[PDB]
Design a protein around this ligand. Structure first.
Ligand SMILES: N[C@@H](Cn1oc(=O)[nH]c1=O)C(=O)O
Ligand SMILES: N[C@@H](Cn1oc(=O)[nH]c1=O)C(=O)O
Ligand SMILES: [Zn+2]
Ligand SMILES: [Zn+2]
Lengths: 258, 258
């Protein structure tokens, strides 16, 4: 009767509460997706347990074994019933899982340390003093691997063979590399993550230029699940009632430090 | 074998070509949705005929008869197989038709004649010298009828009982009212329409403030149609290949006059 909700530790979507080591079960976590899961379970009327994905990945298919990892893999292999997380809606994932209509709209973006002389992806692609990368194993890395746009092909050619690796294990590792690099590392990541980090101390980073593409996050269910329909309607209801706006303001802007 | 694609005359989504009276069938029309229908039919491999909806409406359900009008009605009653148009994804429509993942992201917005002293919906709601309205019978009008947010409740209370009516038959009628009103009429409409009109001569209007909500347009099919799945994948492929970006630039910005 209790459904397993897979998700990932990614601020401010899911975070440990301050005293989480004294707490158990769902009470360990807080954040936008923890709130979204509660609101959705309320409409769909289900009990659920949040489960942080073991491998800390979003979901990609290994080109050799064809095995899905990450939250996507948890759904595909029947280990979770729903993923409530900043999981980007993408073609290759829509072939194997179902997604709700998007609960947030976003785009890939550039994060720089303040004062870095970069205003656009064209600006990063034409030089080499400033290194740049993305999260390993997610949709941003696939965006660059698959692009046929000249500027993005140029960036992919640079990242794919950069040494030491510019592909990071977590977004937090990318942000910390930006922060420690004295302006010599820029990070390509989703605009929602970029906008959150910009409002957090030490307020030393900023999003530059417009977004590179336009996409969304969706709540994901196994292909054919009976949860898919009521979840989708739940998301649309929450959107129309202004709850999603309210949550984004709560988690991004109401605490802003910058 | 030829599928009926319902759509609506709305610039720059679907427009008559300059010499359309000498032309027949699909060649009569041009615009973003005409291009989108061609790209989708290419992936899904179907022949199709564009059909401008008789009543020139998007789709609403009559509260008395429960009958759907507009493009939504064409789908629900089996008179078209697909709607390719700036049809907003909404809860009440998702109960009766299917939508693709969104091909465009947008929000409700305010259109003013340049120089009008309004910078926000709060600004419109607190005065009464400047009248304001929306398209009749679409999702923007429903947004205000259904809102429980104070500022929007206040605006709905004003519009619902304004005389002469502030609800317009087409977006073009709203724009022309803005233009002719000497600053005394503002129009609430979708950001994509607002951004297009701002780049068109006589360049006397502008979008003010941020958007009131965040939603999207989707390609619509009857509930349960076998087209739904291949269309959705087609849209996602076009999104990821940068075709949707390309089309938005073609139809909004590459001709811009302002
Ligand atoms: N939401 C992304 C994960 N990821 O977060 C970023 O900022 N880039 C990136 O690839 C996914 O679902 O794969
Ligand atoms: N896309 C809207 C129609 N409409 O266009 C606007 O700008 N407002 C409005 O209601 C719909 O699908 O109902
Ligand atoms: Zn800890
Ligand atoms: Zn004519």
């Amino acid at each position: 009767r209790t459904i397993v909700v897979t998700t990932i530790l990614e601020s401010p979507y899911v975070m440990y509460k301050k005293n989480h080591e004294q707490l158990e079960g769902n009470e360990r976590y807080e954040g936008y997706c923890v709130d979204l899961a509660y609101e959705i379970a309320k409409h769909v009327r289900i009990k659920y347990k949040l489960s942080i994905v073991g491998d800390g990945k979003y979901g990609a298919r290994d080109p050799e074994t064809k095995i899905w990892n990450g939250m996507v893999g948890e759904l595909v292999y029947g280990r979770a019933d729903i993923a409530v997380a900043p999981l980007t809606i993408t073609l290759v994932r829509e072939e194997v899982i179902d997604f709700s209509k998007p609960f947030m709209s976003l785009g890939i973006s550039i994060m720089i340390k303040k004062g870095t002389p970069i205003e656009s992806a064209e600006d990063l692609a034409k030089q080499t003093e400033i290194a740049y990368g993305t999260l390993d194993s997610g949709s941003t890395k696939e965006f660059f691997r698959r692009s046929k746009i000249a500027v993005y092909e140029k960036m992919w050619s640079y990242m794919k063979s950069a040494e030491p690796s510019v592909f990071t294990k977590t977004t937090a590792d990318g942000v910390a590399r930006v922060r420690k690099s004295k302006g010599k590392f820029a990070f390509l990541l989703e605009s929602t993550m970029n906008e959150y980090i910009e409002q957090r101390k030490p307020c030393d980073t900023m999003k530059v230029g417009g977004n590179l593409d336009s996409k969304g996050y969706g709540v994901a269910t196994p292909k054919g699940s009976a949860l898919g329909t009521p979840v989708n309607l739940a998301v649309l209801k929450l959107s129309e009632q202004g709850i999603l706006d309210k949550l984004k303001n709560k988690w991004w802007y109401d605490k802003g430090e910058c």
